[PDB]
Structure formats: C-alpha cells, structure tokens
Symmetry: C2
Subunit: 284 residues, 2 copies
Amino acid sequence: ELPEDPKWEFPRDKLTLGKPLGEGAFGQVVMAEAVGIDKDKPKEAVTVAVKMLKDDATEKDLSDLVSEMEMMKMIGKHKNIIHLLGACTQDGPLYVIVEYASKGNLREYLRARRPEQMTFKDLVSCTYQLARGMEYLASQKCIHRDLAARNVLVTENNVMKIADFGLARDINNIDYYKKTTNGRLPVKWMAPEALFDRVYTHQSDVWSFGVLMWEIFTLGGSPYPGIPVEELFKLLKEGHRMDKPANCTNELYMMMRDCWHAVPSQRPTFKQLVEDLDRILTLT
Amino acid sequence: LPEDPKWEFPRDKLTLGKPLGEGAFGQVVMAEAVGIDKDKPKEAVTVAVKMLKDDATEKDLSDLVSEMEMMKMIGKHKNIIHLLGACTQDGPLYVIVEYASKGNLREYLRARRPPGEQMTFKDLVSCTYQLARGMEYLASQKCIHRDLAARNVLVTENNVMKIADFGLARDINNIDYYKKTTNGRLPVKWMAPEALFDRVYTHQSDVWSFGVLMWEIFTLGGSPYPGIPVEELFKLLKEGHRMDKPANCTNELYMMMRDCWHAVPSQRPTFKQLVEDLDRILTLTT
C-alpha cells in the first residue's frame, strides 16, 4: 500500500501515543513520546505530535495525509516551519510524526493574550518570522494554499511555525483552469485568481499572508467580520478590502493592502516582505 | 442561486439562536421561524438551521446546496429529517430543517448506557426498525444515502428516529461508475467493499452500511471495528473478518447484521426484507 522510505521511517515499537491535541479536517493529532527520534540521542524520549486518520476517515483523507507527509519531506527544515520528524508507514496505520508546539495555533495564542499581553514589537516579530518561513517555502517551489493564523503553531520558545500542509503543492502540481481547482481552500483567505482563473502561484500565498497579517494585528480577529462567505468575492471584485487594525501602523497596513493587490504580479514577493519587515522590526 | 418560491423563507421571519455544532462543510444553529408552518402563520416554530462556517470553502457551499436539493426531492417521511424551508436569495444560504431535540443517535445511545433513561431491548429493536423503514422509503425514492451511520441519525423529543445529513446522498443515476475517484469521500468503516473495489454504489451498498449502523445501535454507540485501523480494514474484510456479536443482541439479530455484510451485494437483504423481519422481531418481543 505504501512505498518504503527508510530515511524517514520510524519504528512503531518506540512510539507511545498520548492525549489527543484536536480533531481536524482530514485527520487527528495526538501528543506522543518518541524514543530516539533524534538520532544523536538514541535513548532520549522526545515529546512529539502524531497525525493519523480519524476513525471515520475516508479514502481521500488518507490520500491527503499521505500527500501532506510527502510535502513535508520535500520542503526540508527551516526555523519557521513545523518540522517532519519521521513516520510509521509500513504494515500498520499511517503515523506522521512532527515536532510538538506547546502553545497551540497562533489564533488561540493571540486571543488569549488580549489586554502576558502582546507588544507591538512582538506582533511585528511574529509577522517577520512567518514572512521568512514563506520566503523559504516559496524558494522550495512550494505553494501552501492554506495560510492562516489557525495554521501557525507556536513553540515553547514562542517561535512561529507554519503548519498544516494538507493542501500544499509543488508549484507545478496544480491543475490549471479546471473547474474543481482550489475548491477546498477557505474563501476568506483565498486570492481572487484562485477562483476566478483557477490558478495558484506564490503571489496567491502572498494574498493569504496579507490576511494572516490582519489576523495577527487584530490579535486573532475574524477576517471580513459580518460579511458572509457567499458574498465575499463579489465585494472583492468591487474593491472591498478589510479596514486597518488599531494596533496596526499605517505602514504595516499599507503592506497588507499591497498583499491584497488585485493584480497578482503587483503584490510584493515574500523576499521583499522579509526585507521591509526586517527593517521595520530593527527600527522597533 | 436559482429562485424556488415554494421553498423560500423570509429572512426577517427567522431568528438565529444558540449553535448546535460545527460540522464537515457546515454549521447548525437553533432558531425560531415565525409562520413556517402555514397552518399557524403567526406561530414561532423552533427549527434547526444549517449554514456555512466562517472558514468555508467553495466545495462546502456546493455541498450544502446539494444537500438542500437532495432533501427537496426526497419528500416527507416519519423517519427522515424533513426540509422545512430555506433562505437562498440576497444573503447567506440558510437551510432550515426540522429540529431534533435529542441530538444524534450515537450521542443519544452512549448517554443512555447502563451505569455499569436506559435503553430497553425493545427500544433498540424499535430504533433499528424505524431506520429500516426510512431507508426502505429512501430507496423507493431512487436515493442512495452513502453515509449511513449513528452520528448521521437524529432523535426527536418523542424518540422518533430521523435519518439526516444528506450531504453525500445522490439520485441512483448521479454516480460515475468505475471512476477512480468515485466514493472517495465515504467513511471507510461504514462502506461496502464494492464501493471502493468496483467504484459503484447501489441500494445494496446502503444495506451494508445499515448493518454497521445496527452494530452501533446494539453496542449502544460503540465504534465499529475496535482496535482496527481504517487502512487495514479492507484487507481483513476480503479475508472474511466481520465484527463480533454485540453483547446486547440475539443471535437472530446478529445473523441479520452478518447478512447485511455479505460480500455479494445481491445476497444481502433488501430494506423491505429488513423491515419485515424487524417488524416481526419487534412485535414478538412485545
């Protein structure tokens, strides 16, 4: 059923599943103890996160979990991306072992720290880290397609980790102009071209990053508040764009607006966002 | 969205209330619909409303529209959650359906487990009988549910069983036989083998699922194939494996479950036969 990949395979007998961390779209995540997952420490038990199918899993759920694992293999390691640690794929259920982020997704993290409150600098830092994570991802020819605060995890060290690669794809593994393309992307975080033209590029992720930025500076606010999903794209075409967040600087808001530029090629690249953000952070 | 006056319902006549639970492609909230029952035009009827979640995808929307259309074609039946109305024009899509105060059957049964209002043996047979009738009716309407399971059954104030969640249901003819993608979104542990192996789906595929539902009922909400991961299930099924007899049922009722799990679809009973046997078992028990 599943091809061997020795380099990533982890022995089932050295993994001990713990309490669940939450049920998701196509899978379940549980806390776990993995012995020797760090090959330099063969006897150390490391706390990890394990993603597996739910009891009511579908064939497509498995296909998605497999695909998510493969994406994480090809992406590599980076400070601001949740990292793949190994997997149990031979004779037995599929387990995707990834690093554990003790503080949950960014949205929850931020909503809980609404007046250890968050400082302006903290917010710019979170943003900078995520921009840096996306710059790396883009250079790996990978489009995330599901960028959002709920899909960012925060470690014990408050390090931002881009996660949830269930919809991620290689830039060339997209079926352009097909009526079903991008059909499973959350609408309020989606670039307009993703639906109107049925394409997806790094510039599409940049639009999503803009929405992420708005979530960050609203401390976990809900995008397009009061506007139903059904009438969003009509408003987007007409030029509607979310208003500027209070904890936000005019400059940072202009950056969000640039990310929400109608023309894909007129939006900044992740390379540029990192540069401007590094500058702003350094000033702050 | 096209206009369908007969089903349309005034947004100003609807008042959304407390949520009942977020789901796969939607959200259900309790609400008051004034005059939905045209018998009592001024009466505020408590109802259930399904709508998109804030993080909805395009696919979620077409799935809700599809569930709505499916419910429109099925009709009215005692053991099938009934579509009451809908707000499809100028605004968010609201699918207004009959309210079921006791939630889904799984939660209902697990909450009635012995401390070791408990379910009597007859209550379990009655429950099964009611769902067989609902499916028999559904099948006569040329509709295949495809997602039969305890969690997809609602229970009213008076314990009437209601088959719900028609998000995956289809007219017998709206299914692409033989295509690699067909039946890719159906929960594996409740699915008939042919649905995956042959990429087809018929009323007999639904009775296989009905068998698993029966098992959930007599285990008072147990999880099918305990200890068996979904990725290993079909290998075991091909090898003959079948769930064991629940402690709470007779060998006769277990034999019924087993018959529903025949490898050959045509060798499984029809919903009409299931209704007749359950009717007999229920009556003789009384």
